[PDB]
Structures are given as C-alpha cells and as structure tokens.
Amino acid sequence: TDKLTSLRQYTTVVADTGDIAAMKLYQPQDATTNPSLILNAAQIPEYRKLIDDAVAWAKQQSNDRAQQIVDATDKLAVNIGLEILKLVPGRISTQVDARLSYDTEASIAKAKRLIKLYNDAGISNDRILIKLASTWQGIRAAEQLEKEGINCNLTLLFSFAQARACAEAGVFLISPFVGRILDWYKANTDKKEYAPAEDPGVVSVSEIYQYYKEHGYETVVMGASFRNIGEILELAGCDRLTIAPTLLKELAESEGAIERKLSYTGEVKARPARITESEFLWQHNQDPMAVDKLAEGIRKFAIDQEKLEKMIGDLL
Amino acid sequence: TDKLTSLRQYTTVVADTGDIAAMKLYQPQDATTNPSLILNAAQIPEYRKLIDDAVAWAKQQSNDRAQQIVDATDKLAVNIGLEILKLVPGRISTQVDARLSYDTEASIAKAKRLIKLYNDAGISNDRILIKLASTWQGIRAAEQLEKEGINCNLTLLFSFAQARACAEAGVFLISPFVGRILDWYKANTDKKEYAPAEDPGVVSVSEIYQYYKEHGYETVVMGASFRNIGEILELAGCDRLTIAPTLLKELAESEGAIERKLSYTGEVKARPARITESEFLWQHNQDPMAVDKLAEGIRKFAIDQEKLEKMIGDLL
Numbered sequence A, B: 001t002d003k004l005t006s007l008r009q010y011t012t013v014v015a016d017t018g019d020i021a022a023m024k025l026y027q028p029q030d031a032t033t034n035p036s037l038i039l040n041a042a043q044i045p046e047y048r049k050l051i052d053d054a055v056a057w058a059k060q061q062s063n064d065r066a067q068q069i070v071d072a073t074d075k076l077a078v079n080i081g082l083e084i085l086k087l088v089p090g091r092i093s094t095q096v097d098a099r100l101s102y103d104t105e106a107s108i109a110k111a112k113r114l115i116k117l118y119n120d121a122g123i124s125n126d127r128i129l130i131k132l133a134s135t136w137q138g139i140r141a142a143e144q145l146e147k148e149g150i151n152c153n154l155t156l157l158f159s160f161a162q163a164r165a166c167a168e169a170g171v172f173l174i175s176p177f178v179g180r181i182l183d184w185y186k187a188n189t190d191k192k193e194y195a196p197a198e199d200p201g202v203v204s205v206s207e208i209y210q211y212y213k214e215h216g217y218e219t220v221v222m223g224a225s226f227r228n229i230g231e232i233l234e235l236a237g238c239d240r241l242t243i244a245p246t247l248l249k250e251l252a253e254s255e256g257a258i259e260r261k262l263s264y265t266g267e268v269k270a271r272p273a274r275i276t277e278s279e280f281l282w283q284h285n286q287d288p289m290a291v292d293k294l295a296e297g298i299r300k301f302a303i304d305q306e307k308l309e310k311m312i313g314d315l316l
C-alpha cells in the first residue's frame, strides 16, 4: 500500500485546507484553516451559499456597516468550519484576525467571539482550536484562554523561544512551521538544496518534539507548512502533521512503507524556571529567520483578512 | 572653503568614533561611541593605559571573576568617554550592554551604573548621553531615566513607530539610522543604487524630522550611520549628524558651499494620543526592514560586547 496510509500508522494526519472535497477524499482526523485558506475557499462557487448565510446573519445582528463587515467575515470563517466539522470527526482550527497578534486582550476577546459563534451553532469547545500567532502576546492570550476552557493552536512558530514559551503556557497545540523555514534558508544562505534530514525546518520540528517529550509537556506538536513529501516523511511520528491536498495526493499515490523517524524513549527531565518576557524577546531575536518570518506571516495573514473584508464589503 | 565648514552652518556635527585623534582634527561638538567602536578603539596602542586602568579598577571593586570582567568593560567604555570629553565641549554617547535591550529594569540599572562611573570621575549628567536600543523596552527605560535626570540617545531607530514612541517618551535625542537602511534596500530589492534624495535612509530621517518639528517635539534628531557624503549633504539642516572620520575627511577635502535641505516652516499641529505597546508592536512589524535591522544591530552589538569581554578576560 501507500505512503499516506503508512504515515497514519505513526502520525495523526490533518488536512490543511478550507475545501470540503479534500475532507471527503482523504478523511483526515482534524482540519486547519487560516485567513489565506479562508480567502481562497471563498472563491469556490459552491461556497457562495456560505458567504450569503454569513452576510445575512451579520445584517440580522446589527445595523452598523463596520460591525457587519466584521461579523460577516467572522461568520464566514465559522461557516466554513461548520461545513468541515460535518466531515471530520476531530477538530477544526480557525484563526483570529492577525491584526490582533500583538494585542493580548483583543485576541482573547476575538477568540471568545469565535467560540461563541461555534457554540451558538451547536458546536462545543472540544471540536475547536482557535489559532493565534505565537507572539509573546498571543501566547499570553492562549494561556488565559486555556484556563477558560478554550483550546488553542499556536501558529507561526519558528524560534525555540517561541516553542519553550508555548510549552510553559500549557497551550493545547503548537504548529511549528517547516516549509517557511526552508524558504528562508534558500533565500538567505548559500545552500539552496537540502537532503530531508538536513532540511532546517525538519531539524527545528525534531528538536522541538524532543524537548517537549523529554520534559513531559502535553502540548500536541503539529508540524505545518510543507514544500515536499521529503519533509513530511522525515517527521513521521510527530503527534500530528497538517498537510495541503497537493501533498496528500502525492503521499496517497506513492507506493511503499516508511519508517517512524521521530521518537523519544528516555527519562522525563526536570523543567527549568519559566522563561520571562525579556528572556523570550532576547532569544527570539537571536534567530534572524524567526524574526523575519513571524512578522511576515502576520503581515500576510492580515492582508488576506483585509481582502476578505473588501470582498464582504462589496456584498453589503 | 569646504563642505564640512558649510555643513556646520546648518547642523551640529558629531564625530562617530572612539578615536581621540579624530576629535583633535575635526573638533566636533559631541562624539558617539558604540560597542563596535569601543572594541576597535581598544586596539589603539595608546589606549592600553585605559584598559590597564579599567582592569585595575575592576580588581579593586570585587574578587569575583565574572563581576570583574563586567566592571572592566564598563570602566573601559567610560575611560574612553573621559578621554573624548577632554577634547569635545559637548556630549559623549556611551551605549549600554546590548544584551539588555529587551530588559527595561536591567537597562535602567546599567544606565545608572555608567552615569555613576562618569559622576565619580567628576563629569556631570549634562555631558553624557546613555545610548539604548529603541526597543519598546529601551524606550521605557529612557522615559524613566529622563525623569531621573539622565539624558539618553535612542539608537537603532528604523521604523516610524520607533520614532513616534521616542518622541512621546520625551527622550533627549534619537539616532535614526541612514546607511543601514540603504544596506537593507540593496540586499532586499532590485534597485541597488539611489540618488541621494531617493536614498530610503535619507527619506526616513527627513520624514522623522518633519513629524518631530510639526508636533513641536524637542527631542534632538541626530542622523547616524552613513555610507556616502551624498546622504549627509541631503540631510543638511538636521539638528545633528554623527559622522565617521572617513566621511569627515571627505567633507573637509571637498570644495564648495552647500544649501540647507531639511527644514520645517509650517504650523505646530496637535499631538495624538500616545502610541500604546500593541499599536507600536503592530506598526513596527509592518516595516520588514526595521524588523530585520533592529534585531540585527542588537545581535551584532552584543557579539562585540562578548568580544570585549573575551579580551578583558585574557587580561585578568
């Protein structure tokens, strides 16, 4: 049989898309969206009914234009989540407005707003992960949300500082990125091609996994962002991996069995004192790749949120 | 006569070096050092006596090796400042350990430590600027230090967010960078050469100057970091400019009179509400150049501080 089926022996497979066709086809445990994927999903013609439901619901919630745009985009992201939840047994990840990434209180508020929308549609909190960028502020938002029974997916995770802070905050799940790390190394070093074991994204997720297991942290490690099946296969054994349909297709069509790569067997070690905000800021900014890419992912996801608001704006 | 003499009609000229020869030769109003310049100055043979005083003074302050290294490097930076103050009528800028850039309290403490060292040598606070990186944390350190009668030079300033936050904190002086901005644009865009008026470093300082004067802020604007005399001449009229000896030489040997370029004639406008930390973080990370270069300058200055510690370490 196939590499996708072999991988599911070791790793829970998650679909990185807003497209329901992919859920029918690959039957993943969970799904992840983000604002770019939400923007792309809104172009699917069969999803016009979901945009229409969102716009109509928004107009019923208030008579103010600014608030209707905000309500409709939020409701659209949730509507897509609801469709996906019909087809996956596990969780949907839905990302908060990236414009709030450096504001803890606004992020907590928005996370709660989305959770309410899901709850009001009949969905309980154990079906949802609210996606927040792994800034200090997002990590603080998440720590508080976890205490209020809202589980979070900490995304755009590039630096070890970020990984340590998320563990210490007790977040439900992290999404350490692989492909964007590779992207950065190509664009900023001499070395433009990498064996899978040398892929610096793969090295990053592997080192994070080890650290998490060796200190007994229970935060789920979900590798995300992939450029090729080599990266994915080198990470077999990661708790979860979220994978775009293109690469799911490739795995499903490749014959053969693969080995588990990622494991920890040793003793549980003593945890250190919690990293403080100053230590975290210092160690994060030691990593020029992480500096660039965290900020960039936030900028891009915000642009896509604006585009989503422009689109909705034209329909009110 | 010469371009250097013409420039001093419009702008207070500051020497960007730890080398006293340059002070004798160009007779600047003020001087600036930073840790790289302190590291380079320590190689000057005539400065061995200053390293020797610093190491001897450190050994008198404690019997602990780690503390002696720290004390000696601080005392060395001050000893250099003291030599320079003999030769300039105005201020010396001395930078705090860049490893403290994201720690407000440690930065305040280090700033005070340096001020004490100068005071103990008979120098009062109106002869000194403590240099701090323009992180949110450094800007908060500076706001507090200014209230305690310690004047600060806010450095590594790249984003408008940084410029606005420093103005609103009432800091004594800012050092918006020019040449490093140019460096970034060369390395990250197609356009590798710039007319002086198009130089994005020159545009940045010009826009900051305008904003400061149009809101009546009294923070001194001192352009720093230069790659060519074109950048400097396009900024004639800036309150101050700190300039390396290489470029001072070029100005002094270049014949002709230059025209003032930077002025604000209009009406004083009403100030906005203060930028908050979240707004500042958002707007700073909108500027990919600023993101990269602030973090980088901090890393490089810290490496140079480590090198300074290695050197001192070998002499205890």
Ligand SMILES: *C(CO)[C@@H](O)[C@H](O)[C@H](O)COP(=O)(O)O
Residues within 6 Å of the ligand: A016, A032, A033, A034, A037, A093, A153, A155, A175, A179, A180, A222, A224, A225, A226, A242
């Ligand atoms: C959420 C992570 O849990 C996902 O939707 C990620 O944003 C994507 O995996 C990122 O992929 P790209 O790097 O290709 O945008």
Ligand SMILES: *C(CO)[C@@H](O)[C@H](O)[C@H](O)COP(=O)(O)O
Residues within 6 Å of the ligand: B016, B032, B033, B034, B037, B093, B153, B155, B175, B179, B180, B222, B224, B225, B226, B242
């Ligand atoms: C302090 C600013 O007041 C200066 O010593 C600056 O660090 C230098 O001007 C930086 O110059 P380079 O960008 O050429 O290193």
